[PDB]
Design a protein around this ligand. Structure first.
Ligand SMILES: *Cc1cc(C*)cc(C*)c1
Lengths: 245, 10
């Protein structure tokens, strides 16, 4: 996250931190995700497409820091890794960039709700906030485009939803952006998601409830003028989600 | 094949 604020998991209790194990025992952070039911985390396919072996991954819930054990955190293995079969990556855009991870602790249990572990609601079909609405994004991604390391502390920021009409302008993304994607940015281009934030939640207070409106997918750079963050539009994938869940 | 989407991925 470029700009924004440091935060803690209590403020973002649906946030899932996804890591990959390597042969020698080292673990590296991969992507974010969101807990949508006790057994299911939703993320982005592009995070996993090159290494689709579910045994390689670890999922933490209730975790505020990248490389430390926060009190009340829960560690999970991935029981099923489901990537979208129509995922594709073009010049700029990632299409159908959505994935599901069925999580299970070593004892075979799903998430236990607590102050630091809560599910986030899904939207209803084709039901998104109006353009101009403020939404929050959360992640352990880069704080600057030139960083090669991720911050140890979880961050959040607040961005505004951008119309499809604006986002498909030539100096924005043109025809690369589709109706199954959502654009969001800072009006002054000072805060944005970045590399390492992929898979994590774009959350909007919708109709009296915190709702998973988007999934961090792609963008041209980070916090660049006229280059919004692009998010998988969750409200256009409900048949897919419920079919696998 | 290098594609720019490798770099746009967040
Ligand atoms: C091949 C290519 C081109 C650009 C502009 C960026 C990346 C990652 C790859």
């Amino acid at each position: 996250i470029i700009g924004g604020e440091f935060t803690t998991i209590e403020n973002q209790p649906w946030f899932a931190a996804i890591y990959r194990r390597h042969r020698g025992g080292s673990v590296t952070y991969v992507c974010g995700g969101s807990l949508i039911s006790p057994c299911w985390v939703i993320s982005a396919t592009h995070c996993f497409i090159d290494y689709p072996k579910k045994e390689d991954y670890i999922v933490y819930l209730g975790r505020s820091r990248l490389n430390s054990n926060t009190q009340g955190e829960m560690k999970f293995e991935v029981e099923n890794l489901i990537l979208h079969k129509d995922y594709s990556a073009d010049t700029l855009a990632h299409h159908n960039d959505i994935a599901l991870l069925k999580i299970r602790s070593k004892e075979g249990r799903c998430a236990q709700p607590s102050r630091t572990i809560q599910t986030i609601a899904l939207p209803s079909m084709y039901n998104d906030p109006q353009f101009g609405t403020s939404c929050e994004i959360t992640g352990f991604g880069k704080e600057q485009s030139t960083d090669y390391l991720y911050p140890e502390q979880l961050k959040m920021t607040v961005v505004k939803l951008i119309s499809h009409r604006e986002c498909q302008q030539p100096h924005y993304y043109g025809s690369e952006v589709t109706t199954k994607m959502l654009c969001a940015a800072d009006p002054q281009w000072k805060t944005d998601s970045c590399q390492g934030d992929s898979g994590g939640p774009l959350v909007c207070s919708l109709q009296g409830r915190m709702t998973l409106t988007g999934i961090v997918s792609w963008g041209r750079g980070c916090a660049l003028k006229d280059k919004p963050g692009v998010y998988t539009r969750v409200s256009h994938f409900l048949p897919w989600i419920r079919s696998h869940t | 094949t290098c594609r720019q989407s490798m770099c746009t991925a967040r």
